[PDB]
Ligand SMILES: Cn1ncc(-c2nc(N[C@H]3CC[C@H]([NH3+])CC3)ncc2F)c1CC1CC1
């Protein structure tokens with residue numbers, strides 16, 4: 001592969017493609033490799049590579065080493081990254097400290113803002129799609145996986161995509177916005193509402209619309225929707241700082257084509273961080289693991 | 292599976308094996324750095340991994356020596372966490388179709404002689420010199436050859452007095468038969484000369500693609516070692532090195548002449564290859580055969 005890549009074993013699945021460890025043979029550089037069957041009916045892997053390329057040089061954006069084809073596979077070779085926030089959540093006993101939640105929130109809001117600044121919406125915000133860096137970037141949260149991403153505004157005019165209804169749910173359900181469940185075209189607000197659920201997930205260990213009964217997938221999604229709509233934010237966020245409710249209310253009240261106030265959202269959490277008297281050392285819970 | 296050792300290390304996939312254990316790729320969760328992790332399954336009261344880790348500690352700071360992050364116990368395992376390095380010389384040889392240019396062989400020789408001299412300066416002999424136990428650095432240290440695996444190493448002299456260990460016979464055949472010195476095959480206590488003779492076979496292996504005592508099969512380890520030994524003893528150095536610069540044979544003959552307790556002239560051996568390198572018109576620029584690959 002590429003005058004240089006050894007395909008290794010499979011480690012998981014991303015949107016529209018399995019990921020494998022692999023190695024830059026001459027360099028000795030372990031990499032991540034996403035495979036799409038080159039003969040697939042919906043080739044999207046080179047599309048995804050060009051979105052990554054448009055995001056190049058952004059803080060917390062993964063670098064693409066090589067995109068191409070080999071054998072019967074469109075391949076994308078990515079720099080290797082560390083554990084997911086889900087992985088780190090497990091390593092930390094499925095509890096993060098408030099300090100770590102607020103440190104993550106600041107970076108995650110900014111990562112979303114950056115993607116939006118480059119005319120895209122992510123559409124799959126969840127703990128599995130945020131990875132810590134390696135080496136000198138170990139305290140940098142990366143966002144990965146643009147296989148569900150869409151352009152929400154025209155690159156020349158900045159005209160926003162039009163409002164659409166009766167859409168089927170394309171990510172998966174735990175972190176989806178209310179409007180996504182209701183069939184509304186996703187926009188910038190929905191990425192941010194999903195992040196709000198992710199932050200409550202880290203606070204609680206679970207969300208109250210996990211583990212619901214249904215006969216079929218369609219129904220399961222409908223029941224998750226119903227649970228989200230019928231659980232007031234003040235009940236969802238009971239016993240946690242009011243900032244988490246304020247953040248979610250804000251995102252839920254945004255217009256479809258609104259530019260979110262990302263600075264207001266960061267400032268909510270920063271003000272909380274100041275009130276709590278946490279030190280400005282940028283140390284996460286997992287940085288204190290000792291042998 | 293996400294497996295975790297020593298509280299702060301993720302243990303990934305197996306990448307190979309070394310002396311007394313398997314090696315795994317991993318990650319230091321707390322410091323955010325990739326590492327290599329060695330695991331020893333303990334079968335007796337006298338395990339090897341902690342002993343090995345102290346050898347590495349004694350060598351710390353040397354050029355081309357990996358740093359150790361942690362060594363400890365977990366269930367029936369000993370675990371040693373190390374600085375991650377790049378591909379081995381055997382990996383690179385395969386990647387290059389089991390052909391290295393002369394320039395590459397001589398760049399490698401210069402550094403390999405130096406790594407062995409450094410281990411000797413710290414009062415140890417390595418005892419399993421082979422391509423698999425030399426790794427290139429990562430990134431900006433990619434021009435640097437590292438030496439690894441001290442599981443079979445031994446102290447050969449006193450640190451203060453330089454008193455050398457005694458000559459002994461009837462030793463077991465430790466190491467790798469392909470690259471072992473003739474004295475090692477004969478059961479003689481290993482010393483500095485034997486590390487350097489092994490290096491000489493490595494260099495000819497790189498020149499040839501294989502050594503002429505590869506391929507032979509036996510029922511037992513002794514019979515295998517013997518077939519190799521006989522072929523080694525019965526193949527003159529000038530027949531082994533036929534069609535290659537005279538320096539390769541001069542190197543092996545020098546090593547074979549050394550007395551058990553002789554201090555090798557490492558400088559002479561380096562100069563022998565450097566003089567060749569320059570007479571061939573090569574530029575000393577750390578440009579190895581694998582660095583010439585285009586996109
Ligand atoms: C979905 N996706 N897309 C790209 C990558 C992806 N994954 C990694 N490393 C993984 C190592 C195992 C850890 N448990 C998770 C991170 N590095 C870079 C990537 F782009 C991934 C995560 C891989 C686990 C599938």
Ligand SMILES: Cn1ncc(-c2nc(N[C@H]3CC[C@H]([NH3+])CC3)ncc2F)c1CC1CC1
Nearest residue numbers: 306307308309314327374375376377378379
């Ligand atoms: C035997 N041993 N002991 C320590 C190490 C060892 N291996 C590495 N990296 C390996 C990455 C994959 C490459 N294919 C080979 C080198 N870094 C540091 C080490 F100490 C090794 C080499 C690993 C292949 C087993």
